Amino acid sequence: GADGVGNASGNWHCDSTWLGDRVITTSTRTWALPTYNNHLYKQISSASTGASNDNHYFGYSTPWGYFDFNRFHCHFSPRDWQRLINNNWGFRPKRLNFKLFNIQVKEVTTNDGVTTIANNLTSTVQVFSDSEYQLPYVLGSAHQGCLPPFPADVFMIPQYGYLTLNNGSQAVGRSSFYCLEYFPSQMLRTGNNFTFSYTFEDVPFHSSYAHSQSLDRLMNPLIDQYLYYLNRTQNQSGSAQNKDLLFSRGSPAGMSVQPKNWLPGPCYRQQRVSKTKTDNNNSNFTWTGASKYNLNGRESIINPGTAMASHKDDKDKFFPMSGVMIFGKESAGASNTALDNVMITDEEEIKATNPVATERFGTVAVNLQSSSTDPATGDVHVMGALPGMVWQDRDVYLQGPIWAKIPHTDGHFHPSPLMGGFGLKHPPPQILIKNTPVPANPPAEFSATKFASFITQYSTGQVSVEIEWELQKENSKRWNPEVQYTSNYAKSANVDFTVDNNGLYTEPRPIGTRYLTRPL
Amino acid sequence: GADGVGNASGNWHCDSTWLGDRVITTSTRTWALPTYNNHLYKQISSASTGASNDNHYFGYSTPWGYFDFNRFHCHFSPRDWQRLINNNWGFRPKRLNFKLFNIQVKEVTTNDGVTTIANNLTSTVQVFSDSEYQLPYVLGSAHQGCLPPFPADVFMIPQYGYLTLNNGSQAVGRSSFYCLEYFPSQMLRTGNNFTFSYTFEDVPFHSSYAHSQSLDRLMNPLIDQYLYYLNRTQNQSGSAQNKDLLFSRGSPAGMSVQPKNWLPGPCYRQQRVSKTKTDNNNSNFTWTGASKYNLNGRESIINPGTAMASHKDDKDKFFPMSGVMIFGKESAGASNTALDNVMITDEEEIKATNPVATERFGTVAVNLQSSSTDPATGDVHVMGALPGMVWQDRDVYLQGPIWAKIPHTDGHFHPSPLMGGFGLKHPPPQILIKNTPVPANPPAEFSATKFASFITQYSTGQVSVEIEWELQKENSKRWNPEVQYTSNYAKSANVDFTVDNNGLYTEPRPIGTRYLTRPL
Amino acid sequence: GADGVGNASGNWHCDSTWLGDRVITTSTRTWALPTYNNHLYKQISSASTGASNDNHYFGYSTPWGYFDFNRFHCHFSPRDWQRLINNNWGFRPKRLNFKLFNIQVKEVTTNDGVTTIANNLTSTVQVFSDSEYQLPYVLGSAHQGCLPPFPADVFMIPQYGYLTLNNGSQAVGRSSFYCLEYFPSQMLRTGNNFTFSYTFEDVPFHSSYAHSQSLDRLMNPLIDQYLYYLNRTQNQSGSAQNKDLLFSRGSPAGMSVQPKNWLPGPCYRQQRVSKTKTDNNNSNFTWTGASKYNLNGRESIINPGTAMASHKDDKDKFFPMSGVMIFGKESAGASNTALDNVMITDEEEIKATNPVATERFGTVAVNLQSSSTDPATGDVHVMGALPGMVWQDRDVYLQGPIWAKIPHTDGHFHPSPLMGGFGLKHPPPQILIKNTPVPANPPAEFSATKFASFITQYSTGQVSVEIEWELQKENSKRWNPEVQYTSNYAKSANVDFTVDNNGLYTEPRPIGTRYLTRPL
């Protein structure tokens, strides 16, 4: 496709269409692309900064921008997310369709505060997709600059930059420098457009259900087992205490002691924290007493950690210090900002198979009891994989990420990205875009020295993403009604997920998926 | 094949041929086979020896020898190994071709120091392969008696012996005795020959690359996250200390604290040791304080352990006490021998995903903090499998082993052999060889008693192994040059990997594979 | 091809693809073309300048710019140049593909320091290639203004000028004046593009190998010759001295005296110079004592001269005063600049066949000895071609030139361009470009006088060059590893061949091709 200047090179397709076991989301947004790094690649590092062994880094910043739509609210509207959630046991991405169009390249001259922009028709913008995955993958890091949840919102394209191997503030020989001009890319003038398609590999359905049973309560409450266990090791004959070995068979009465077939999910304990400041130990323990890992000398906090239930029982006032998803709030700030300005996610429905994050996994025997030595018991705070273990993965949220690239390694384990979502060996590729450098008038005599005088300019276009999602419909024989996500029927000053008098789109709370119930 | 006495039954095929995505190695060596155990199977154990509960063993020794080429330098010359390494992201074995020929059976009579050897033409040697895997598999134990790296070197065939079930120095009812004459085997005279072929199962490519990114530095250095975390639990208002809950969003400034999707590899910590004797604690802690496992009462040191980085940062002077590969050095001895006489392997390139072996994995929350109890932090020294972990496996070396038989078990986990290499459910089968017993003159009257008088004899032949290796070529968009294995250009008394004035082949250092760089 | 204003007339093709015995490099760069000499041809000479008989010149300067990509780094990235070098005994250019596109013609008016640029759509730029080689060829002179090594770098088109016959500051009858408008050239507006293809003649592969033997050491160290020579002309009988004629046969003991079949390469001696200022004779001898040639009254220093080894043995501190390639260094200057700001090339691997440049070729008999006159010996400092001679040519460098036009002469000798590279009778032709003159408003009444009022304008576009290189793969039976170009594995502040924090691309050192070794 391509036709003159005065001819639109694409239309506005923004819709969702539901088709039984599929749903097709289509989003279009208007974007703006600044000319980054004044056309330059720059070496960047932590050198001559606040330092901190655990915060050092080496890398480069590119003149390139990139497209990001790795966020559910990029595709589903609240109402749709509602439909999805309330009626489906699962879902996953099948097909992807990307279109880039109505390119407009503007040039801006600024003379004495008086700053004026005009059309540079002959100017070109470059785009290409890293289909071979040869560039460092940054999409799976939950950065900013996705498509706005609200269709009517214009957005700015994020600048592309990447991290290579660092020995604190310094690079090593095996460190990689990538030049994006060393890729074939398609050049567009105002009449041109770019289009491209992708198919998702076979990933399991995201579990948008919650169990209506719990691992420990899986038996028939009305029947005894044919199995036995050691009940008493000291008999009560009014003789005070007197050795003995007494066994009893599993009973409804004593469920906690019946032999069972499975174990709860793996565990890596986290520090508890209360939402009401009072309950909390004084002092600053966010780093000091936070669970973290030690990679080549530097520590990094295990943030969303192994998928564990957030709080036990009623105590909805607690949460793992760094083991849940915390979302912004539009009005929230950089680094200050109180609990009133964020939204914490509650991973409640997985209590049925997963260990609670703040409490321990369980208790282990630690010695060889005998007449002369007492039986001892240790607490187990970290629990790796065990044959017979089962579990759920972290949920996904309307404001959450969708997929991430499984790292290319000799080995991995249940590669569900930890922030939640779809783990793909070959994820939707990165789409790189960039304004083509337009030199200002050069000297009237030749000069070898690098070129520095560029006509400053930026670009705007529309972008369209279409995704085909496969639904896994619900087959429930549950007699009683289910829990559904609903809006509050009562009167109110504002309507959830709308704009205010100032015209700002706002997302009231995070919304997970797990409402419907399957038995274990 | 078979033709008279004066007719060669095979040629000398020793070559390597490179074919884009394949390489075919062919090695021929000259071998010598002694008549072992004077034709006898012997029961063998630790009984009436130095004992030690952890060293007891019951087993048998056979009159049979066996062929072993489970060592890269059996097939690749240095130059080739260089080619392999410097240009390929991976590789693996496809097809195997084994030929045995030019059989010569010599008889030796020795009368009064004057010891003379002559040709026994009518003498036979027996050979056969354990195709059904019905013999105890000894190839995957890094023993001696492989094909010499140097083609011109003659070698002696290892004697075959095995271990069955032992209750310290004693056997049990379920212990197994195998007789190798209870296998059909092919008998060869001087004109005969033995040939055989095998195909490898589908194993992943060995990762002969190093990551040009690290698990913790995977984000876009230029952009904030849309995610938040608990930054301060106590605010600084000049009020000394005053509770509070403050959150901030992920920043390039604070990478160690940004939520991430993945975890570093599993961990089983090892004791650190310095190459310069000074730095080390006095005393003998090699066993005393070495990490080890407890199997049925007896302990065994976890030698090459879980694959972990050998030393952090610059500190190339340290190494895991028993968590790296140590190679001989020709002039090295049995059990004395200093560091000057061995070669220690540095697993450095895997720092990017794997925990360091000497340091800890990370830190875990260990209590339920509150106003009245301080937040506590434990060190974690052992780390099992976690959903979301990724890792590399130990590298392989030119002098290293190539494959090992995955034990036939009801369950296993990431069955990469721990010393490095290819884990095969059905590996190249064992090739058993043996000189056929030739009785000396018997009594002139019959005697039922066991035969003991045998003409002493040995045998020489050539052996040829041909292997077809599948390469996985490099697809890098890295702009800057890579790290290559090179020889030192500068003048020198000796040339690496050659013979000396005395004609002894010598391997200067171990050579791994990981030189080229793929992003994560 | 050609389509409206708002339609890109070409894409960004910048890639390398490796195909067994071929490699295809494709480069695209963004260029800027000034309007040179204000649209005028100018006569130029050395008249009324500093003079110097050896620096006089007559010629002309043209309004035309020209494209130059005669430089390896125009096509190969560092990593690629590494691949080429480390694995191939040779290589050469086969096919050429040139495309010029996305033309943009800008007009610039400048009124009171306020200088503004706009699009002049209807403006045209002229391009054509000297396919018949009728223009003076300037590409083979290692001038500036080639395509930048770094893809992201914008560059300025060199202005075309040429030299004709001069009798110092003056021209002669047979001097030639060439008008570039007297060539058919294609005219382009913003929507037009220019394309063109070329096939290289058959040139020998460049020798990207080093010999693993030397001319003098070609014999069998274990065997005598059957040849004899005159060993002693005076016998030692204790008789002090006493005539005689004694012959011995060639021995491994005396290799320097054994008859041999070949001679080392030709020689034109150069002055030695030390990198450490101390070692050097005081005084300014760069011209005074430099080797040079005398062409029609004027002297010119033999710069890169006959191909000779740069320094003997270990002495890497010396170099031929004007017999090696010296490269800039980005930060280097016009004419000041110390050794710290340049890069000198070491022609070391050719010691094996070529004379050392600073030392003498050898020694010659110079008289007819006899009883009454002593035998005399002269030093030979210049050595022409001799039947039996063999040699290598100067190597080529990643920053070095690729080809040069063999002068059209009645005769030449081993026409390998002296600066290194490929000598072609018909090299890639010169591509001339130029902005078309656009007159400003003329008088309202006719005037015969030459037109002087031009709207000032410049142009920008992309340029693409694609080259198909034929590889000569290595067929080595060397057992030991080879020397490879590698990057230093150790930590560092900067990564070789990248940009710094200021975004400036920098080339660490020169890189030659000769790493692999073929026997003589």
Side-chain angles (χ1 to χ4, degrees), chain C residues 299-483:
Chain C
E299 289 187 312
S300 287
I301 175 181
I302 310 294
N303 196 82
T306 288
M308 284 164 303
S310 297
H311 61 65
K312 88 176 188 180
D313 287 331
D314 316 77
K315 314 189 166 188
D316 243 86
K317 74 178 178 188
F318 295 110
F319 68 80
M321 188 188 27
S322 50
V324 302
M325 300 289 298
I326 325 292
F327 289 120
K329 210 169 175 178
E330 286 114 21
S331 54
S335 29
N336 39 287
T337 276
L339 183 167
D340 223 278
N341 275 151
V342 304
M343 307 172 291
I344 292 87
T345 51
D346 207 340
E347 297 289 353
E348 280 190 49
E349 291 70 33
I350 93 183
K351 292 172 196 160
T353 49
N354 297 35
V356 217
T358 60
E359 291 192 353
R360 92 220 101 129
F361 172 68
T363 60
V364 205
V366 263
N367 64 353
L368 301 123
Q369 71 89 67
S370 69
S371 241
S372 47
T373 35
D374 302 278
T377 270
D379 269 12
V380 52
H381 306 265
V382 160
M383 194 36 162
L386 282 191
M389 276 177 167
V390 318
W391 66 94
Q392 291 298 281
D393 291 317
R394 192 173 306 285
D395 199 323
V396 288
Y397 301 86
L398 182 42
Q399 309 88 332
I402 311 169
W403 72 82
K405 179 202 165 175
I406 321 258
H408 191 118
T409 57
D410 248 31
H412 32 251
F413 185 85
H414 201 277
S416 189
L418 260 351
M419 299 190 256
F422 298 98
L424 318 180
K425 280 198 165 85
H426 306 92
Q430 312 192 87
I431 318 280
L432 294 299
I433 188 176
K434 161 196 182 218
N435 302 307
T436 302
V438 178
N441 66 319
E445 279 182 353
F446 172 78
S447 180
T449 63
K450 188 174 180 176
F451 216 86
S453 211
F454 299 110
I455 306 182
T456 56
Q457 54 181 38
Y458 72 110
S459 53
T460 269
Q462 280 64 83
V463 66
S464 281
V465 165
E466 185 190 80
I467 290 179
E468 185 181 333
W469 306 89
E470 182 186 356
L471 310 183
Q472 184 191 25
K473 282 293 177 179
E474 153 252 2
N475 190 191
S476 199
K477 261 307 183 203
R478 172 192 176 108
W479 178 271
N480 50 116
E482 293 248 26
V483 188

Side-chain angles (χ1 to χ4, degrees), chain A residues 2 41 43 60 120 122 167 170-171 173 177 181-187 189 191-192 438-440 443 446 448 450, chain C residues 5-8 11-12 14 16 80 103-104 106 119 144 156 190 458 460 488-489 491-492 494-495 498 500-501 503:
Chain A
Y41 286 89
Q43 172 177 93
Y60 296 93
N120 191 340
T122 68
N167 181 73
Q170 265 179 147
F177 173 51
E181 344 286 302
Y182 199 47
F183 285 86
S185 53
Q186 182 185 334
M187 311 198 66
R189 290 192 169 174
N192 296 283
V438 177
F446 172 71
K450 190 175 176 175
Chain C
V5 170
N7 211 108
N11 282 0
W12 191 281
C14 196
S16 74
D80 281 321
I103 303 309
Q104 315 172 233
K106 301 292 175 82
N119 274 117
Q144 307 178 111
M156 187 183 195
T190 180
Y458 72 110
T460 269
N488 190 19
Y489 67 96
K491 65 168 188 176
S492 179
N494 296 323
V495 203
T498 72
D500 53 35
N501 43 94

Side-chain angles (χ1 to χ4, degrees), chain C residues 148-278:
Chain C
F150 197 60
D153 277 3
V154 176
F155 79 114
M156 187 183 195
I157 311 290
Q159 177 189 177
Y160 177 80
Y162 60 97
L163 267 20
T164 197
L165 290 181
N166 66 99
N167 179 74
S169 170
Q170 268 180 143
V172 296
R174 284 175 178 84
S175 291
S176 286
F177 176 45
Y178 303 99
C179 174
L180 273 49
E181 339 288 305
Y182 199 45
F183 284 83
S185 46
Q186 181 182 339
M187 311 196 69
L188 314 180
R189 290 196 169 172
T190 180
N192 296 289
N193 76 330
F194 172 84
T195 189
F196 148 92
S197 298
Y198 165 96
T199 307
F200 286 92
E201 52 201 82
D202 306 84
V203 299
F205 289 89
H206 170 76
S207 48
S208 60
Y209 60 95
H211 299 279
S212 47
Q213 290 181 289
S214 63
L215 217 170
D216 56 15
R217 294 299 176 273
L218 249 71
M219 7 68 181
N220 187 349
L222 316 202
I223 317 290
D224 284 21
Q225 293 171 327
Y226 53 80
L227 252 286
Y228 282 78
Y229 57 115
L230 185 52
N231 191 35
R232 297 193 75 82
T233 153
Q234 151 188 296
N235 82 334
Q236 267 306 315
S237 185
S239 179
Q241 301 167 91
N242 222 159
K243 306 293 183 68
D244 213 32
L245 292 167
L246 288 152
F247 308 100
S248 32
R249 79 186 175 213
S251 196
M255 298 185 178
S256 60
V257 303
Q258 287 183 358
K260 300 181 208 77
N261 266 318
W262 321 105
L263 300 174
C267 174
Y268 198 86
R269 192 174 181 169
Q270 279 223 160
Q271 193 57 77
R272 192 171 59 175
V273 172
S274 181
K275 296 179 189 183
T276 54
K277 310 132 76 175
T278 292

Side-chain angles (χ1 to χ4, degrees), chain B residues 383-399:
Chain B
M383 201 27 162
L386 282 196
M389 268 181 176
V390 313
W391 68 94
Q392 288 300 283
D393 291 322
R394 187 178 304 290
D395 198 325
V396 294
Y397 301 86
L398 181 44
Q399 312 94 323

Side-chain angles (χ1 to χ4, degrees), chain B residues 150-164:
Chain B
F150 200 66
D153 282 7
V154 176
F155 79 113
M156 186 183 197
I157 310 298
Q159 175 185 180
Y160 177 74
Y162 60 101
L163 274 19
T164 191

